[PDB]
Amino acid sequence: FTLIELLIVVAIIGILAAIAIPQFAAYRQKAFNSAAESDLKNTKTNLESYYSEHQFYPN
Amino acid sequence: FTLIELLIVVAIIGILAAIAIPQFAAYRQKAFNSAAESDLKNTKTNLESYYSEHQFYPN
């Protein structure tokens, strides 16, 4: 209710809004690379599964 | 502790939960076919065993 208090509130809000958030692009790239890894491993397993019914890999 | 971090966590969880698991029906069908193969081979061996005590196959 005092013009000093509101100015201090504005200053503290400006201080708090400048917090450095963590990097997110690399964080998501981690998940993307893990997805690629899992896909490759599952593809290897599926290919070796196919090599059981017949005696040759695809093509 | 920041609403941005929790949203990124939700996004990464959604990314990780969509991983393509390997096909399993064919994997189990492999074992089923192998069981059939082994059963047939053992049946042949048992029939030739019976053909030793007597001089005719069953029936």
PDB file of all heavy atoms in Angstrom, chain B residues 35-45:
ATOM      1  N   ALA B  35       9.485 -76.916 -31.030  1.00  0.00           N
ATOM      2  CA  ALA B  35       8.903 -77.986 -30.229  1.00  0.00           C
ATOM      3  C   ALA B  35       8.271 -79.051 -31.112  1.00  0.00           C
ATOM      4  O   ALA B  35       8.433 -80.253 -30.864  1.00  0.00           O
ATOM      5  CB  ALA B  35       7.872 -77.413 -29.258  1.00  0.00           C
ATOM      6  N   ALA B  36       7.551 -78.628 -32.152  1.00  0.00           N
ATOM      7  CA  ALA B  36       6.965 -79.591 -33.082  1.00  0.00           C
ATOM      8  C   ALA B  36       8.042 -80.432 -33.759  1.00  0.00           C
ATOM      9  O   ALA B  36       7.901 -81.656 -33.897  1.00  0.00           O
ATOM     10  CB  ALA B  36       6.120 -78.860 -34.126  1.00  0.00           C
ATOM     11  N   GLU B  37       9.132 -79.788 -34.175  1.00  0.00           N
ATOM     12  CA  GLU B  37      10.234 -80.492 -34.826  1.00  0.00           C
ATOM     13  C   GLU B  37      10.834 -81.549 -33.906  1.00  0.00           C
ATOM     14  O   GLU B  37      11.029 -82.709 -34.302  1.00  0.00           O
ATOM     15  CB  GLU B  37      11.298 -79.478 -35.235  1.00  0.00           C
ATOM     16  CG  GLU B  37      12.371 -80.000 -36.151  1.00  0.00           C
ATOM     17  CD  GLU B  37      12.831 -78.940 -37.124  1.00  0.00           C
ATOM     18  OE1 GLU B  37      13.317 -77.885 -36.666  1.00  0.00           O
ATOM     19  OE2 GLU B  37      12.695 -79.151 -38.342  1.00  0.00           O
ATOM     20  N   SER B  38      11.145 -81.154 -32.669  1.00  0.00           N
ATOM     21  CA  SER B  38      11.739 -82.089 -31.721  1.00  0.00           C
ATOM     22  C   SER B  38      10.794 -83.244 -31.421  1.00  0.00           C
ATOM     23  O   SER B  38      11.228 -84.398 -31.304  1.00  0.00           O
ATOM     24  CB  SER B  38      12.119 -81.358 -30.436  1.00  0.00           C
ATOM     25  OG  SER B  38      11.025 -81.321 -29.540  1.00  0.00           O
ATOM     26  N   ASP B  39       9.496 -82.955 -31.289  1.00  0.00           N
ATOM     27  CA  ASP B  39       8.530 -84.018 -31.044  1.00  0.00           C
ATOM     28  C   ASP B  39       8.502 -85.015 -32.195  1.00  0.00           C
ATOM     29  O   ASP B  39       8.458 -86.230 -31.969  1.00  0.00           O
ATOM     30  CB  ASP B  39       7.140 -83.426 -30.817  1.00  0.00           C
ATOM     31  CG  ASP B  39       6.032 -84.418 -31.106  1.00  0.00           C
ATOM     32  OD1 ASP B  39       6.066 -85.533 -30.545  1.00  0.00           O
ATOM     33  OD2 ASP B  39       5.126 -84.083 -31.897  1.00  0.00           O
ATOM     34  N   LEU B  40       8.530 -84.525 -33.438  1.00  0.00           N
ATOM     35  CA  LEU B  40       8.534 -85.442 -34.575  1.00  0.00           C
ATOM     36  C   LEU B  40       9.785 -86.313 -34.584  1.00  0.00           C
ATOM     37  O   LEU B  40       9.708 -87.526 -34.831  1.00  0.00           O
ATOM     38  CB  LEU B  40       8.419 -84.665 -35.886  1.00  0.00           C
ATOM     39  CG  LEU B  40       7.926 -85.476 -37.085  1.00  0.00           C
ATOM     40  CD1 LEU B  40       7.115 -84.600 -38.014  1.00  0.00           C
ATOM     41  CD2 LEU B  40       9.081 -86.110 -37.836  1.00  0.00           C
ATOM     42  N   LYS B  41      10.950 -85.713 -34.325  1.00  0.00           N
ATOM     43  CA  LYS B  41      12.182 -86.500 -34.331  1.00  0.00           C
ATOM     44  C   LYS B  41      12.160 -87.568 -33.243  1.00  0.00           C
ATOM     45  O   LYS B  41      12.538 -88.728 -33.480  1.00  0.00           O
ATOM     46  CB  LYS B  41      13.391 -85.582 -34.162  1.00  0.00           C
ATOM     47  CG  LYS B  41      14.167 -85.356 -35.444  1.00  0.00           C
ATOM     48  CD  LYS B  41      14.723 -86.658 -35.985  1.00  0.00           C
ATOM     49  CE  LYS B  41      16.033 -87.021 -35.311  1.00  0.00           C
ATOM     50  NZ  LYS B  41      16.806 -88.009 -36.111  1.00  0.00           N
ATOM     51  N   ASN B  42      11.701 -87.203 -32.046  1.00  0.00           N
ATOM     52  CA  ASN B  42      11.628 -88.173 -30.961  1.00  0.00           C
ATOM     53  C   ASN B  42      10.616 -89.270 -31.268  1.00  0.00           C
ATOM     54  O   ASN B  42      10.821 -90.430 -30.894  1.00  0.00           O
ATOM     55  CB  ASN B  42      11.285 -87.467 -29.654  1.00  0.00           C
ATOM     56  CG  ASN B  42      12.325 -86.440 -29.265  1.00  0.00           C
ATOM     57  OD1 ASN B  42      13.510 -86.604 -29.550  1.00  0.00           O
ATOM     58  ND2 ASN B  42      11.887 -85.371 -28.613  1.00  0.00           N
ATOM     59  N   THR B  43       9.518 -88.928 -31.947  1.00  0.00           N
ATOM     60  CA  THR B  43       8.552 -89.949 -32.339  1.00  0.00           C
ATOM     61  C   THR B  43       9.164 -90.937 -33.319  1.00  0.00           C
ATOM     62  O   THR B  43       8.929 -92.148 -33.222  1.00  0.00           O
ATOM     63  CB  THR B  43       7.310 -89.301 -32.943  1.00  0.00           C
ATOM     64  OG1 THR B  43       6.867 -88.237 -32.093  1.00  0.00           O
ATOM     65  CG2 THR B  43       6.201 -90.327 -33.087  1.00  0.00           C
ATOM     66  N   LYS B  44       9.949 -90.440 -34.279  1.00  0.00           N
ATOM     67  CA  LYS B  44      10.635 -91.345 -35.197  1.00  0.00           C
ATOM     68  C   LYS B  44      11.571 -92.280 -34.442  1.00  0.00           C
ATOM     69  O   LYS B  44      11.603 -93.495 -34.703  1.00  0.00           O
ATOM     70  CB  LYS B  44      11.414 -90.554 -36.247  1.00  0.00           C
ATOM     71  CG  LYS B  44      10.638 -90.267 -37.517  1.00  0.00           C
ATOM     72  CD  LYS B  44      11.425 -89.365 -38.451  1.00  0.00           C
ATOM     73  CE  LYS B  44      12.289 -90.177 -39.399  1.00  0.00           C
ATOM     74  NZ  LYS B  44      12.293 -89.601 -40.770  1.00  0.00           N
ATOM     75  N   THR B  45      12.335 -91.733 -33.494  1.00  0.00           N
ATOM     76  CA  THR B  45      13.256 -92.571 -32.732  1.00  0.00           C
ATOM     77  C   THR B  45      12.505 -93.625 -31.923  1.00  0.00           C
ATOM     78  O   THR B  45      12.922 -94.788 -31.869  1.00  0.00           O
ATOM     79  CB  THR B  45      14.127 -91.711 -31.817  1.00  0.00           C
ATOM     80  OG1 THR B  45      14.779 -90.699 -32.593  1.00  0.00           O
ATOM     81  CG2 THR B  45      15.185 -92.565 -31.149  1.00  0.00           C
TER      82      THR B  45
END
